[model samples]
Target: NKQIFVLYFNIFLIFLGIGLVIPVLPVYLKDLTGSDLGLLVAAFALSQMIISPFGGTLADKLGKKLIICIGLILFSVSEFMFAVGHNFSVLMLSRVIGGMSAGMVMPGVTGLIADISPSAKNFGYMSAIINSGFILGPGIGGFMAEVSHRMPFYFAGALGILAFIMSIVLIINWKVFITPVILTLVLSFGLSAFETLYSLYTADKVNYSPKDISIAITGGGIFGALFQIYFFDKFMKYFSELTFIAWSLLYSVVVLILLVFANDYWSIMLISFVVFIGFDMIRPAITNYFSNIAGERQGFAGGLNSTFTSMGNFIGPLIAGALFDVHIEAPIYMAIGVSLAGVVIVLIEKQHRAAAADLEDNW
Candidate 1:
């Protein structure tokens, strides 16, 4: 239990470092290139989508801790590149590399927690702790960036170094393997579209000042952290993963619709909060679901999940940006449509699960 807690804490630190860098990177790129900012963001995300599955396969074969260390080192190197890189193209490449490192680390951390958790009872708590780093990191990062544009990236590099040291000193016997290529491909594509669109919707529709946007994101983070910490266990205990996912999909769909009608900053903020809460809830629920099924392959499952998420992050922004060029409100409508499609996926998964359970009972 103690070991698991330490591992979770370490993951928290790593994600915190990531959060600090995320908000500032797009803005920095915008300043540098003054063109195709959306495309640049999409390119970075796409690189993550492409690399994440490979990263996961590498992690499964090499070990989660080793992969984590590699990721941290790569991230640090990327950060240094970002700090010194003089051209937009160079910075974009740096971001792509950084995203790949991040894609490797994120799922590896989650899979590690699933590996060590004593039972399902502890899953949400562990997830919450891990998520706290995500929430707190961005808040701190936003403030730090306010001090100097480059300060957040420098700070992120320092934290990545710290996480690297910790990974080397404390982590041991991480798993390694090759995930099925087909599975990785499917997961990556599904998640890529979801992530990219959501972010695009938020940025395009929210209409808040940069500071306010940061605050709203931080608020969402805090809400997710608190909800997972205190209430996620209850939700997990009572609701099946399919049920939670269904609800999340529905919530996201509804929120997107509401966002279409939202005309003011406060309305946008409220919708953002609701959407984030739903988004955060589904992550642990899915992790728990995969953990139950994957058994010894939990690490692989985690890696796949991360890979897909990276894929989503990569493509979503570009797609949405294109829509935005067509009409500012297009992203919101796109989100609602996509989310409804996710709901259908959840329903199909639920039906399959039910049918499988029935067959087992008959046997």
Candidate 2:
């Protein structure tokens, strides 16, 4: 149990480091380049997409703890780069570095979760705990950014160092599938596009102040956090992970559409919960879906899943950023269209005849 707690804490801490940069990034890119934000976001995920699979494979060769510690050190370096660099090329380089660390770190942490879990049922509980860090880390990051944007990165750098140290102390600790992974990647692409642009959108479209942006982001995390803790299990009682994913996709589409039309902070604020609830549910659904099929090699599955989804995060911003260059509203429309397509795929994919129960099956 204590070992499990350490693994979970480690995930939280690494996420805290990454999430520290998220809320400030749009603003970060804004100061750096008016039109390059998407690419910058993509730059981070692109490195992850390229290296994540290798990171997973390598973890198979070495202990998960070693990979994790190495990843954390890379993460620290990445943030430190971001903290110090002022040139366009230097900033882009930082994201590339961060991506490599993401590839190495995330899969290792995920493998640790799988190593500890007895079955798929525990994954949701474990995932929610992970989100406890992921969801709030951004809010804290955003809040700290009010102090200074570079401070968040510096703080994130320190967090990475701390997590690396933790990885060393925890070095002795020991630790899925394509369809759900694909679905997740597509969904993540849309979310990534939307999220990459969200702070900018709120500021330019809705005229939200930075404080409002922080509050709005934090508020969304709160709803998402609560849903994972309380409603996710209840939801599973009534629906399969894939079924819920479908509904959530549809809900996300609606939220995106409404966001396109929404004119005020309050209206966007009210609908933000839908956005949070809709897309946030897809994560654990994918994690658990792949976990069921993963059998014992949870590390490979987790790493593969991250690699694929990180590709989505890469795709989301590059394409969305390109569209964003065309019009501020373009990325939002693209996200909606993508979400609609996801709904279609979920509807049409013939159910597979898995040994697991139908409710437990992937689309």
Candidate 3:
């Protein structure tokens, strides 16, 4: 575990910057314009989706370190753009470039982890530590936003620069693959809808300030951190992978439904916690399922994982963006629809597989 310190730090620092910016982005986007916020947000994921597959292929030939640093330098430039830009066009440009930077950095770090330990038990551990940044980021972002919304962007920009230099000195690897992939894709899409509009929605619907939003977000982060830090490995005891995914989707549907009725900060925070847990389960369950079936195809499995994830991010924002103004609740409904549909499809597929296995047993 200690041997993989560089890889973990890389992951952690990346998350830190993202955490710093997300809460501030909605307010920031509002100044630039709320109407196209979804498009801008989706652009980040879209660029990553478009670049992820190819970036993986490129890393196979180029050194992981070189490609990752390139991403970081790119990321730094885009962040500073957000800090200084006073126009929607320039802001959108930052989103696209930022997404491209993610494409490079994410895959490179993933490769480093896999190279260290293809099935490292510590993956969850490292992931939790990095993700824990979400808990702290809102508070930091909020404080910065208090001074000025642009301040958080500047802070994030500085963080990006700092991360790159550290990388001038730093490691990637992971695998998992198909039923789980579908779950991951849908879950990602579902959450991205919430994510793409979270601070905006809260401000519009609940009349919360940046500080209030940060506290609510931190509440959700605490729930998620508790799970990953303590109970993630224990999830298997309660349900088989298939059943767990079913649980994941069903709970997600319910969470979105609750949002339809939610009207206050505390109510939203409670919902956020459930979302954190339910969404968290889907990815790990799917990935574990991938691990069981991957055999020698680990690298291929690893490469395609991001492709599916980015697909969700790319779609969620575009769809959520278009429908957001139609109704503040539109994206929430879309999330429910997507995940509910996903649950049904997964069930039908699961039944078919079960039936085929039964036939094999009979034979």
Candidate 4:
């Protein structure tokens, strides 16, 4: 329990550091155009995409504790860089460093968690804790923002430093589930595409503002976190991780279609919240599946998970934005098609695995 809590706290701090910067970014870059913002976001995603596999490999070779510690230190440096930087170039540099920090921290922390407790229940709680950090960070930053424009970054840097110190005071030690990897890549691609375009689509279709989109997203995040905390374990008692993944992909397909059809304000918000169920379910389920098969290669598996996710995140928005340029409804159709394919793929894999298991059992 002590070990698990320590890892949880570490993971929370890593995400919390990132979250602190998110709300203040628009204000900080108030003079920048939407295209500029997109560039900065792309820079961060690209940097992480490049570094994630290396980070994971290092975690396995160098040890989870070392990589995690270094990640926290890098995060602090990036926060400080953002606090002092007044130009777009420096800001982009800060985002790159911050992204690298995330690349290192996620695999290291997740690898440690898997090594400590490799179970769906543990991963559910881990996901919940990570979301809790993200949920709380913006609120904290909001209060800090009243102090000064730069106050949030300064405070976030200090928190990262504190987390680094705390991680130093605590220490830890740390396969591939390939089917889950493919599943992760597919789902992440669809999810990122939807996330990248949803606000744009809603603003065009329903005349919702940034504030309205924020409320819907935060509501979904809270609901997802609560479900993982209170109900995920119970759900897993009756089904395997692959079953959960298959069914949730199907659920996502149905919900994406409903989202396309739903035109009212409340209806869209309600469906937006409903969409998190598939996302929240598949994420932890896939991580749990990876952990079960990873064995000694836990760090590599964790890293691969984050790397592929970054790849999806990096590619999805580009394609989605292009699709949006062609037609507003195109990305939604893409997500639906991708999700339906994921359902088919997962079901086929499931059947093949079950048959293989039967062969072993009979032999």
Candidate 5:
């Protein structure tokens, strides 16, 4: 338990580092490059799409602990680069490199927890601990950024150093680790793309103050944290993973469409609230489903899932930006398409599960 807690804490700090950059990165890009805000956002997403899958594969083969340490080091280096650089190109490169490091760190940490969790019942706690880092990191990061543009990155680098040390102490056992990094890469690509589009869309249409945008994001984080803490296990008890995922996707589609037509800030806020609820629910459902399928190789499964998510995060922004160049509405349409694709994937998974269950019953 002590080892698990240490590992979890290490992961939380890594997440904190990632969060520290996110709210500030777009603003930084705008200030540095004097470029279109959309393009800057796209650049960040593009970096993630490119790096996450490769990072996941590396983690699987080289060992989760090693990959995690390398990721933190990379992120620290990248943060330092951002702190010092004034040019748009240099800042963009920093984001790209940081995204890759994040890709490695997130999935590797989740996989570690999955590896050590004692039972299915424990998965919720594991997910919560992991997700909390994600939730808290951004809020803290945004607050720090509000104080000083450089503060978030500096704080993040310091935290990364701390996490690197903890990783050394907590992740001493690597023999049981599994390797299936390729699949994770594929999944992350799609997920990263989706995330990129959603973020760009929100930024484009809402026209909110930076504080408002951060608040909206933090609201999503709050929903995610609460769901993981209080509702994940119970939600699973009432619904199959596939069912929950499908419903969540469907809900997102509906909310996003409503957002498209929403004229006022209040309407956008309402839609965002609904969208986040679905988004928050989908994460745990997906994590739990993947962990169950992984059986003894829970770490590998968790890592793979995170990799795909990162991939999606990476891709979504670049494409969405391109689409936005054509028309502001382009990203929203793209998001709807991606959500529909997600729906199809969930349906396929559901069918596969039913078939497997039937076969088991017959036997």
Candidate 6:
């Protein structure tokens, strides 16, 4: 349990570091013109996607604790770089380094957790911790930015250092159902595009202010964490992860289509929260599924999950951004098509045949 707690803190710190840069990044790049902010953002996810498989495999060979500690040190260095570096090239370099640390830490912590206690309960707890970091870090980072543009990075670096120290002091005592490759890819595809499009959609169509967009995003995260922490395990009792995956994908498709008709502030806000329930549910379900089938390759499984997710996060926004100009609702329409395709695949995949109870008796 002590070990798991340390792992939990490690996971939380990784996300906190990632989120700390969110609100303040524009301030850092305020002077640069036509620099294409998308590249800076894409660089991070691209690097993470490239390194995740290697990091996971290395964790399996090198030991989770060592990899996690190294990742923490790298994360600290990256934040420190972001604090000091003002040039465009240097900032992009910092993002790449940060992404590497994230890639390493994600699989290391998740693999270690699976070793300690491979349960949906534990997975849900991990998801909730991550969402909390995502929710709180932006607010805290925004506050620190008032002091200086670089202040948030310094704070994040210090927190990373502290987390690293905790792992050493704890002297950790501790230690899936599905392939989830295609499933997670599709899940991220829809959610990432939705997140990007929602802001644009509301701000342009509904006359939403920046604060209003923030409210909807923060509220969605809270609702997501609430479901992960309180209801995820309970949900596992009533149905398999596969069932949840299918239903959630279907649910998301419906809500996204429903969003087209929702033009009011309250209606959009309510739908935003509702839409996230499906998004949040699918992540843990797919992660739990990966853990179930992982056997001794937990690190590899977790790494692939992160890799595929990064791929979607990287691609989803690019496509959405491109299509938003073609038609106002084009991105949402794309999401609906993508998500429906996922629903169909989940229902028909033969990999799930192993999960069927009558497998031995049937053809």
> Which has the greatest TM-score?
3
Q: What is the C-alpha RMSD of each candidate to the true structure, in Å?
A: 5.6, 5.0, 3.5, 4.7, 5.8, 5.1
Candidate 2 lDDT, tens digit per residue, 164-283?
666677641121244666687776777667776677777778687666777777788788878766787788888987788888888888788888889977899887765777766777
TM-score of each: 0.75, 0.86, 0.88, 0.78, 0.75, 0.80
Per-residue CA lDDT of candidate 1, range 1-363, in tens? 466656666557555644455456446645532125456655655666676677768887996778877877888888778777858788778777877776677657767766766556565555555445655665566667677777777877787787777677675232211212222232323333333333434555554444565676677677766666677768878887778767876876677677677867788788656555665676677657656666675555655555554565455556655766677566557666666666666676668778989999999
Better of 2 and 3 by lDDT: 2
C-alpha lDDT of residue 36 in model 2? 78
What candidate 5 gets wrong by more than 4 Å, as runs, is: 15-22, 32-70, 103-139, 165-206, 294-300, 348-363
Please report how far candidate 1 places residue 304 from its true position, in Å.
2.8
CA lDDT scores, all candidates in order = 0.62, 0.73, 0.71, 0.73, 0.62, 0.74
**Candidate 6: clashing pairs of residues:** 176-291, 176-292, 176-293, 176-294, 177-292, 177-293
lDDT of 3 by residue, 1-363 (tens): 553676666556555554466677666654644457667667777888898877777777895788888888888788789788978789788878888787888788877777777564655554455446534565567767888878877777777777776666543333224466777678778766676667778878878788877777777767767775476667788778777778778987887788878987788868866666676656666666666667777666655666776777677777776777777778888888888878886797679789989999999
Give residue 292's error in model 2 in angstroms.
Answer: 3.7
**What's the CA error at residue 92 for candidate 2, in Å?**
1.6
Candidate 5 per-residue C-alpha lDDT over 1-363 given as tens digits, one digit per residue, 9 for 90 to 100:
776777667667655554455567556555532124335444544555566667667876896679888888988888888788878788778877777676667667666766766556555565565455655555576677777878877877787787778777776243212212322332333333333444445666666654665676667667757755677667778988678777777887887788778868787776655455665666666666666566566655654555455545445555655776677676677777767777776676568768989999999
The digit string of per-residue lDDT tens for model 4 on 235-345 reads: 789788878888888888888899999999999999977776777777778778777877776556666777776776667666776776678788889888888878888
Residue-level lDDT for 304 in candidate 5: 54
Ranking by lDDT: 6, 2, 4, 3, 5, 1
* lDDT computed for candidate 3: 0.71
* RMSD (Cα, Å) of model 6: 5.1
Best-first order by TM-score: 3, 2, 6, 4, 1, 5
